[PDB]
Every structure is written in C-alpha cells, then in structure tokens.
C-alpha cells in the first residue's frame with residue numbers, strides 16, 4: 001500500500017523523434033497502482049523534473065480529503081522542482097479500473113498510468129474470474145515538447161496543434177513511421193477469457209475501439225460494475241475507463257489467423273477543424289498456433305467511421321449500472337436543487353497591440369454558463385480553509401444568464417464571446433443536485449466529456465437538441481442509470497445527472513479535453529461541512545506546497 005513516484009526527465013523515442021518527457025520512475029505510461037476495495041494507498045511524489053507539477057487519482061472520491069486530490073490551483077499549489085509531496089488515496093466505493101495522471105497544464109500527456117482496484121478479500125467479481133487482465137491505455141504522442149505545444153497556443157490564441165499519433169500503451173502501432181517493431185502485443189490462449197481494462201488517457205478525442213474477430217462483453221466503467229452487454233466496438237471518452245471481457249475462441253489449428261488487430265480511432269464530427277485521425281493498433285496473438293497461421297497481416301476490425309454519430313449514440317445508450325444485492329444502487333429520487341449548465345467553446349477579445357489566431361482573429365476560450373474559468377494564484381482549497389478574500393467568488397450560477405436556441409447551428413458572431421472569472425458553487429453537505437449539461441452550437445456542436453472530482457454520479461437522461469425541463473425528466477432512467485465520473489454529453493445535446501453532495505471539500509468539475517480545461521470549461525463545487533465528524537473536511541496536512 002505504499003508507492004514512490006519519482007517525476008523524471010526521461011528520453012523517449014517514438015515516430016523516430018527522440019525527446020525528453022516527464023515520466024514517472026522513467027516509465028511511459030507510468031506504473032500501475034494496485035489496490036483492493038477500501039484500501040488506503042500512500043504515494044510519495046518526488047518531483048525531480050524541470051517544472052511545477054501535480055498528480056491526481058482520477059475517479060477516486062477522496063472522502064473528506066481534497067488535500068490529496070491534485071488539480072493545480074484548485075486543491076493545491078504545485079509541487080515545485082526538487083520538492084516532494086505525499087498523497088493519501090482513500091478508496092471506498094470504487095472497484096474496477098481507474099487511473100492517475102498529472103493535473104497541471106498538459107503534463108498528463110505523458111504523466112499517467114492505471115489504477116486497478118480488485119475485489120477485497122472474501123469477495124469476488126460478479127463475472128467468472130478472468131484468466132488474465134491487461135490495462136489498455138489509449139493516448140496521444142506529439143513529437144514536439146508538449147509544454148511548447150501548450151505555450152504556443154497560449155501565445156497565438158489559436159487552436160492547439162493536433163497530436164502526431166494516437167497510441168496504445170504508449171505505442172502508435174503497426175501503421176505509423178518507426179513504430180512497427182514495438183507495437184504493443186498481448187498473448188492469448190484458446191478458450192481463455194481476458195479482462196481488458198481500457199482507459200482513455202488522451203487529451204483530445206473520444207475514441208472508437210475494437211478487436212478484430214472478437215466481441216467484447218462490457219462489465220464495468222469508472223470503478224462501477226455495469227449490466228453486462230456484448231458489442232463489436234466501444235466508445236470511450238478521455239477520463240473514462242471501460243472494462244470488458246474478451247473470449248479467445250478462434251481456432252489455433254492453422255485454419256484461422258493467429259494475430260488480430262486491436263484498433264482505436266477518434267469519434268469526431270467537426271469537418272472544419274483539424275484532428276489527429278490516425279488509427280492506433282496493437283496485436284492479439286494466439287501463441288500456440290503454427291507459424292503458418294501468422295504468415296499474413298493480422299486481421300483488422302471494422303471501426304465506425306470517424307463522424308458516425310449513430311454508432312457513438314448506440315454504444316452510450318447501452319450503459320446501465322449493475323444492480324444486485326452484492327452491488328446495490330442509490331439513485332437520488334427527490335432533487336433539492338436543479339442546475340442547467342451550458343457548455344461552449346468561445347472567444348474573448350485579442351489583447352491590445354497583438355493579432356490572435358482564433359476565430360475572427362480573437363483568442364479561443366471556453367465556458368460553463370458563460371463563465372470562462374481562470375485559475376487563481378492561491379489555490380481555492382487554501383483560500384476556503386483560511387477564509388482568504390479576493391481569490392474566488394461563490395456565485396457560479398444555476399442557469400445560463402441568457403436563454404437562446406442553444407443547439408441551433410451557426411449562431412451569430414455576437415454569441416461567440418465569453419467572460420473570464422473564478423466562480424464556484426457552494427452547497428450544504430448532503431444537498432441532492434440534478435446537473436443538466438447543455439452543449440451549445442457556438443463554434444461547433446461537439447460532445448464534451450464532463451468530469452466531476454470527488455464524486456461519481458448517476459446519468460439519468462440524455463438527448464439531442466435543447467433540454468426540456470418539463471418533458472425530458474419524464475423518461476429519465478431512475479432505476480439503473482450508469483454510475484460514472486465522466487459523462488459524454490451528446491454532440492449538440494444534453495445529459496442529466498444526479499448525486500448527493502456528501503463529500504466535504506473543494507471539487508473540480510471540468511471538460512476532460514485538456515484544451516477546453518485550460519480555455520475555462522470548468523467550475524468548482526465547495527461542499528461545506530455537515531454535522532458530525534464524518535461530515536467534516538480533514539485538516540490541512542502539515543507540508544502542503546506553498547503558493
């Protein structure tokens with residue numbers, strides 16, 4: 001239950017381009033944290049790298065413990081080069097696959113890895129014990145320094161350069177330059193079943209994913225078992241994890257291929273905008289088949305076309321919590337407070353005496369309810385703990401300030417603009433929230449993976465167009481809605497979720513596309529202390545990084 005994570009400057013080559021990246025213990029992707037349900041894990045983080053950094057345990061509630069949650073300038077100031085900080089990871093309701101990642105700037109492009117939470121002793125999976133288990137991390141690779149990619153977009157006000165490759169476990173795969181020799185490979189044995197622990201650790205795109213010749217039985221997401229369902233492909237958004245069983249059925253007598261491509265490729269609908277649309281591949285190999293069975297290329301799966309919105313919708317519609325006696329659910333039935341939260345990409349005016357590269361030569365930005373979040377220089381959590389004025393404003397609104405036909409295409413240029421602020425939403429302990437995310441069509445309808453730190457939530461509804469508060473709740477799933485920490489809000493649509501705000505602390509909510517995070521598609525929930533010691537935020541640890 002104890003790890004040392006040393007942030008290292010590590011030389012890595014992909015696509016024949018060598019660079020020095022930030023990595024953890026010289027590993028890219030970083031090491032896997034293994035735990036069992038309800039463990040407490042300690043991670044000592046030693047920043048031996050060249051820049052300010054933080055780490056986050058994605059999807060871990062961290063009850064009463066925002067001090068170890070990680071988001072830069074939200075719960076802590078950064079771990080400075082040469083400093084260290086000890087994180088306490090408190091696992092509770094989570095069982096399945098989560099992941100950890102840097103939560104500063106774009107550092108998670110290389111600083112990330114898996115979290116595996118096994119059933120605690122005396123319990124078992126709700127499915128037959130897999131023969132083997134394999135994390136499958138989807139990610140991106142840039143040849144340039146990721147920090148320079150970020151800094152250039154900050155200077156120009158234009159869009160972030162697209163990655164040069166999509167990756168599986170750090171490796172672009174068979175169809176990229178200088179990549180075929182080190183394509184990720186896993187061995188399978190006929191008749192055995194494998195648990196694929198799929199994590200989308202990329203920065204930019206929802207991804208379709210599939211394995212040639214093999215159906216996938218999905219059994220969990222975001223640390224919560226799902227009602228099982230079998231598919232030919234999945235959709236997975238940055239922030240999300242998806243667990244699925246693969247059954248190695250294909251013949252090993254030489255009558256069938258012994259090698260099968262695992263493959264992923266973006267789901268992306270904006271034809272006007274650049275995307276790293278390259279697929280990434282890995283190989284499933286049946287090891288006890290004859291050499292002739294691997295004479296040709298591995299078989300390829302059919303992936304939905306990149307703009308196949310129906311295929312995305314059809315996967316997401318199948319997600320439902322597993323509800324049994326061993327795995328109960330608690331859907332909040334009576335809502336104390338409703339929020340409508342419009343999600344937009346935006347512009348702000350270019351700075352004086354400068355030309356910017358964003359739409360209309362303005363500077364790109366993003367907003368929730370038309371507030372574009374800007375990080376403070378004193379982290380929110382210290383400001384809340386010490387009652388420091390002038391850091392944040394506690395009036396993030398429950399509804400957009402101007403109602404319009406949110407999803408109508410090509411809104412007029414005057415609706416592009418937004419305004420910066422550091423606004424948070426303060427709620428009493430135990431408040432039951434229904435949060436409805438409403439995508440707008442400003443600068444292009446787009447699916448956004450909205451993520452809430454400190455909580456999972458029940459996704460009770462979704463649809464296309466504008467949420468109708470007097471009609472859409474009538475068909476909510478109040479029985480087995482999926483329990484997620486990151487929800488794909490539909491392209492040009494809405495998603496409704498509910499949760500009890502019963503975790504006292506300071507909790508980031510943001511789109512899990514990093515460019516939208518930095519542009520300001522974020523806010524913060526401060527959940528005040530309740531009554532009793534179990535409803536009190538933990539005290540500040542003695543060695544928090546200084547601001």
Ligand SMILES: *[C@@H]1O[C@H](CO)[C@@H](O[C@@H]2O[C@H](CO)[C@@H](O)[C@H](O)[C@H]2NC(C)=O)[C@H](O)[C@H]1NC(C)=O
Nearest residue numbers: 348349369370400401402414415416417418419
């Ligand atoms: C989001 O906020 C921006 C900035 O506050 C709004 O743009 C302003 O709109 C008023 C008119 O209502 C103008 O007088 C200002 O000049 C605008 N500021 C600009 C363009 O920088 C924008 O209308 C809001 N959008 C919404 C609520 O959808």
Ligand SMILES: *[C@@H]1O[C@H](CO)[C@@H](O[C@@H]2O[C@H](CO)[C@@H](O)[C@H](O)[C@H]2NC(C)=O)[C@H](O)[C@H]1NC(C)=O
Nearest residue numbers: 051052053077078079080081377378545546547
């Ligand atoms: C690395 O993080 C530290 C801590 O946030 C930054 O140092 C602070 O910078 C602010 C200005 O925004 C000053 O008001 C504080 O006095 C600084 N605190 C220190 C030095 O302990 C530092 O700027 C960050 N480095 C970079 C490159 O952003």
Ligand SMILES: *[C@@H]1O[C@H](CO)[C@@H](O)[C@H](O)[C@H]1NC(C)=O
Nearest residue numbers: 046082083084085542543544
């Ligand atoms: C880690 O940081 C603390 C200060 O917060 C320092 O006293 C300690 O010596 C550092 N090094 C370790 C723990 O190896």
Ligand SMILES: *[C@@H]1O[C@H](CO)[C@@H](O)[C@H](O)[C@H]1NC(C)=O
Nearest residue numbers: 144148149150152160161162
């Ligand atoms: C971003 O891409 C453009 C090509 O469209 C290139 O000119 C520029 O150098 C790239 N930026 C960085 C930081 O590599």
Ligand SMILES: *[C@@H]1O[C@H](CO)[C@@H](O)[C@H](O)[C@H]1NC(C)=O
Nearest residue numbers: 175261263279281300301303
């Ligand atoms: C990946 O893309 C390459 C280049 O377009 C293509 O030749 C290959 O068939 C693709 N692989 C899969 C599995 O889709």
Ligand SMILES: *[C@@H]1O[C@H](CO)[C@@H](O)[C@H](O)[C@H]1NC(C)=O
Nearest residue numbers: 349350351352353354355356
């Ligand atoms: C800066 O901008 C102002 C206002 O647009 C302009 O009058 C001034 O000439 C600019 N400064 C230069 C070009 O050095």
Ligand SMILES: *[C@@H]1O[C@H](CO)[C@@H](O)[C@H](O)[C@H]1NC(C)=O
Nearest residue numbers: 404405406407408409465466
């Ligand atoms: C909103 O926009 C949609 C899409 O263009 C359109 O079909 C619908 O009629 C609009 N609704 C109203 C009330 O104008």
Ligand SMILES: [Cu+2]
Nearest residue numbers: 058239451512
């Ligand atoms: Cu995350």
Ligand SMILES: [Cu+2]
Nearest residue numbers: 057058059453
């Ligand atoms: Cu998180």
Ligand SMILES: [Cu+2]
Nearest residue numbers: 448511513516
């Ligand atoms: Cu987004």
Ligand SMILES: [Cu+2]
Nearest residue numbers: 071451453508
């Ligand atoms: Cu986050």
